[PDB]
Design a protein around this ligand. Structure first.
Ligand SMILES: COCCCOc1cc(C(=O)N(C[C@@H]2CNC[C@H]2Cc2ccccc2)C(C)C)ccc1OC
Ligand SMILES: *[C@@H]1O[C@H](CO)[C@@H](O)[C@H](O)[C@H]1NC(C)=O
Length: 335
């Protein structure tokens, strides 16, 4: 069912690495800073029921079901395995406020939140923008619940991620905001419904298509800070860029940053190009300092992986529209 409503959620940009918005859970609302993640399908926040020995829980807003008059018990155990770290808890139902829309939602109350990476999170939890097919415990995702209300103008949602005291970013539910892109959208259909993954025809470092020569997978992940490939793809890519491995990232000598070649991603018709300004954290120009790159190795496990993941590094340059109606992703040059 379609209506007229488009709803927007203002995002906060934390150091070009974390982009989060705010949602309200319960009556009265308990507000949480949440990542709107297309790479996952579950909604979750840290629970009041989380032990004060998980230091992550000490530094994040906890959901207290005993303060909500709209809370409905469930209690089913839930383990959400991301490849950066793992969270577990149990299921709860309450009213979720997301940019003007009020939806009764089944979410996870996280009781096991590991310091790594959650002590580094500026966000409290996650709002999964992925499909039911990838929902742990087959829980109806928030977007499907909002689509059911028959209020949205279109069965689409869009991401705008800015570059780091202005607008950090914006999600528009039920359409796109033309103030944030220019030109026209170019769509690439999904390999299959259930995952925001598209076929990638090749990755070129410089003028020559050095990688993904015989085609590969590209997951459009709004919950990811960087553009990621498999350990092997990143090894070849990084050798071509002249980058050194450092444990958690890849660096180049700061002076070498601007001179690095453009990286292009063949998606659908078009070539989506990123210059060294689009992927280097140019914090200095010193030959005596090491500058990190906004491209990391990430081995996503099967069935979704092995795949490339186009995160915030990509979405910054290209405004993204996720079409639930036509099972496709659209890209336009961001403003
Ligand atoms: C751009 O800003 C967003 C936040 C970036 O910062 C952080 C992000 C994360 C993090 O990795 N994810 C889950 C990733 C992304 N989509 C699903 C999954 C990968 C995957 C795994 C398996 C299959 C598909 C995809 C979150 C959202 C829990 C952890 C710590 C962070 O900082 C401390
Ligand atoms: C928990 O929620 C699911 C629906 O998501 C439902 O089918 C199940 O019966 C619920 N269990 C309890 C204990 O309420």
């Amino acid at each position: 069912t379609l209506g007229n409503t488009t709803s927007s959620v203002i995002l906060t940009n934390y150091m070009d690495t974390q982009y989060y918005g705010e949602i309200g859970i319960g009556t009265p609302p308990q507000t949480f800073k949440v990542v709107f993640d297309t790479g996952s399908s579950n909604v979750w926040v840290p629970s009041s029921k989380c032990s004060r020995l998980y230091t992550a829980c000490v530094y994040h807003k906890l959901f207290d079901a005993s303060d909500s008059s709209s809370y409905k018990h469930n209690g089913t155990e839930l383990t959400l395995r991301y490849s950066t770290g793992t969270v577990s808890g149990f299921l709860s139902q309450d009213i979720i406020t997301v940019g003007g829309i009020t939806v009764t939602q089944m979410f996870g109350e996280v009781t096991e939140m590991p310091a790594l990476p959650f002590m580094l999170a500026e966000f409290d939890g996650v709002v999964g923008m992925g499909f039911i097919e990838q929902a742990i415990g087959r829980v109806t995702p928030i977007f499907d619940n909002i689509i059911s209300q028959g209020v949205l103008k279109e069965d689409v949602f869009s991401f705008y991620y800015n570059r780091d005291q202005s607008l950090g970013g914006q999600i528009v539910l039920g359409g796109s905001d033309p103030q944030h892109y220019e030109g026209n959208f170019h769509y690439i259909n999904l390999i299959k419904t259930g995952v925001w993954q598209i076929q990638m025809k090749g990755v070129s470092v410089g003028s020559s298509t050095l990688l993904c020569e015989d085609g590969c997978l590209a997951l459009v992940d709004t919950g990811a800070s960087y553009i990621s490939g498999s350990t092997s793809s990143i090894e070849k890519l990084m050798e071509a860029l002249g980058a050194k491995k450092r444990l958690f990232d890849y660096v180049v000598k700061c002076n070498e940053g601007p001179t690095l070649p453009d990286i292009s991603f063949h998606l659908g018709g078009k070539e989506y190009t990123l210059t060294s300004a689009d992927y280097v954290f140019q914090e200095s120009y010193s030959s005596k300092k090491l500058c990190t790159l906004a491209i990391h190795a990430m081995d996503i496990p099967p069935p979704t992986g092995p795949t490339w993941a186009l995160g915030a590094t990509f979405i910054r340059k290209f405004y993204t529209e996720f079409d639930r109606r036509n099972n496709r992703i659209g890209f336009a040059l961001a403003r």
